[PDB]
């Protein structure tokens, strides 16, 4: 019973940002040292918890949200940020107690023809609630006229593709993002480390 981050980080394929993939880590021990002592991550921003120290403290649940965005938008995966990704795809709450882990993945998620299979939402009547996962393809009514699933004048499909090319600039290259959220309820904890 060793926490399988193995089948999250090293996972062969990743999810599209708006359709982000949550893994409920429970009843296992994790040497988190495995992750941070590895040099090969662009962005290991931790918010409201020392990861060096939680290898001797027991949390009820570790949630691991995995998905792909272009490197430019990595910064937007942080509490209080706003924009396309922040407000329409994957929101984080202000009292976030986890880490954002992102590595460049041009090598994996970019075709010569352009890997259009990774997507992102563009419009929405309102902003996402924290940790909301919206996958509806409602034909988005911008202007006055109500759309009856008919596209066109003031009516648009709410998702778009990324088009990752190996020749794209480092910013428009695809980064793979894991987000380790930690919760501590009043139920007996089940995700500790060694020390």
């Amino acid at each position, epitope marked *: 019973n060793l926490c399988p981050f193995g089948e999250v980080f090293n996972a062969t394929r990743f999810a599209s940002v708006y359709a982000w993939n949550r893994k409920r880590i429970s009843n296992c021990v994790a040497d988190y040292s495995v992750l941070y002592n590895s040099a090969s991550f662009s962005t290991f921003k931790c918010y409201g918890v020392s990861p060096t*120290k939680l290898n001797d403290l027991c949390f009820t649940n570790v949630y691991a949200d995995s998905f792909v965005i272009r490197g430019d938008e*990595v910064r937007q995966i942080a509490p209080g940020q706003t924009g396309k990704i922040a407000d329409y795809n994957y929101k984080l709450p202000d009292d976030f107690t986890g880490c954002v882990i992102a590595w460049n993945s041009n090598n994996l998620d970019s075709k010569v023809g352009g890997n259009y299979n990774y997507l992102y939402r563009l419009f929405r009547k309102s902003n996402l609630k924290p940790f909301e996962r919206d996958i509806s393809t409602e034909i988005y009514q911008a202007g006055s006229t109500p759309c009856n699933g008919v596209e066109g004048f003031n009516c648009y499909f709410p998702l778009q593709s990324y088009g990752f090319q190996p020749t794209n600039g480092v910013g428009y290259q695809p980064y793979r993002v894991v987000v380790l959220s930690f919760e501590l309820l009043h139920a007996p904890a089940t995700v500790c480390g060694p020390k």
Partner: antibody, heavy 120, light 114 residues
Framework: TQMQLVQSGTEVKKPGESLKISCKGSGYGFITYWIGWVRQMPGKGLEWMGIIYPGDSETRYSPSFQGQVTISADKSINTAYLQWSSLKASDTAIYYC????????????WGQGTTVTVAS | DIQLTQSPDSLAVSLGERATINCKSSQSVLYSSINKNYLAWYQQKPGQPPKLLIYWASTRESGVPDRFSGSGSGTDFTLTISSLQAEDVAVYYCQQYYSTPYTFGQGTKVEIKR
């Protein structure tokens, strides 16, 4: 240990001159670490100046420093910096660089501190 | 937007008696999410940098004796040194890390009453 912070040597400077003191991260997993800077003035308390995340160089300042000093980070040598446009006598103090692993984290690792003395 | 005031400023204690230090915050530092106050305690023996003694108000750092223990309820926090010893003489600061800018108290000198 996990992480140790080494700091630039002692700096004897003249009022007006500019100065960039270093703080390097000895060891592995520096990537998670956010290096803060603290000023202890001669026989005074600890003032938190600002923190930077070398990763995306995400920098925050104390209102008491915003437009005085620049905190930079050359992440390619795990080195956070603190510099002065032009040094006051006041800026005479000892300057500790202090890492936490993450933000809203207690500073769990401290450099021995750089002593800066601005006077003829 | 937070700000701290410690008390008292000085504390003289006979070797092996208790010693309490109060640290009050103008804003609550409780993380609603995980019922923990984001408040810490630092010792600084002169010539050295500050040493972390306690985090989340009450949890001890590695390399810190049992006699050190912190308590606190929202806006009011205390550091208690039961059985004061030789090498415990130093300045003691509390620091909030609920949010930037991190802020320290004015410090507390602790000396051995003889």
């Amino acid at each position: 240990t996990q992480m140790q912070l080494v700091q630039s040597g002692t700096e004897v400077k003249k009022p007006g001159e500019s100065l960039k003191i270093s703080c390097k991260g000895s060891g592995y997993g520096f990537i998670t670490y956010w290096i803060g800077w603290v000023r202890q003035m001669p026989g005074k308390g600890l003032e938190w100046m600002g923190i930077i995340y070398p990763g995306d160089s995400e920098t925050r300042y104390s209102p008491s420093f915003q437009g005085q000093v620049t905190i930079s980070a050359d992440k390619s040598i795990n080195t956070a910096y603190l510099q002065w446009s032009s040094l006051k006598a006041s800026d005479t103090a000892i300057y500790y660089c202090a890492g936490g692993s993450g933000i809203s984290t207690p500073m769990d690792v401290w450099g021995q501190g750089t002593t800066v003395t601005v006077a003829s | 937007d937070i700000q701290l005031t410690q008390s008292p400023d000085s504390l003289a204690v006979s070797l092996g008696e208790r010693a309490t230090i109060n640290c009050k915050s103008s804003q609550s530092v409780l993380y609603s999410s995980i019922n923990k106050n984001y408040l810490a305690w630092y010792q600084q023996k002169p010539g050295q940098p500050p040493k972390l003694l306690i985090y989340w108000a009450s949890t001890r750092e590695s390399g810190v004796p049992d006699r050190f223990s912190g308590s606190g309820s929202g806006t009011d926090f205390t550091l208690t040194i039961s059985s004061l010893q030789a090498e415990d003489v130093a300045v003691y600061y509390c620091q909030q890390y609920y949010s930037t800018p991190y802020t320290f108290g004015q410090g507390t000198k602790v000396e051995i009453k003889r």
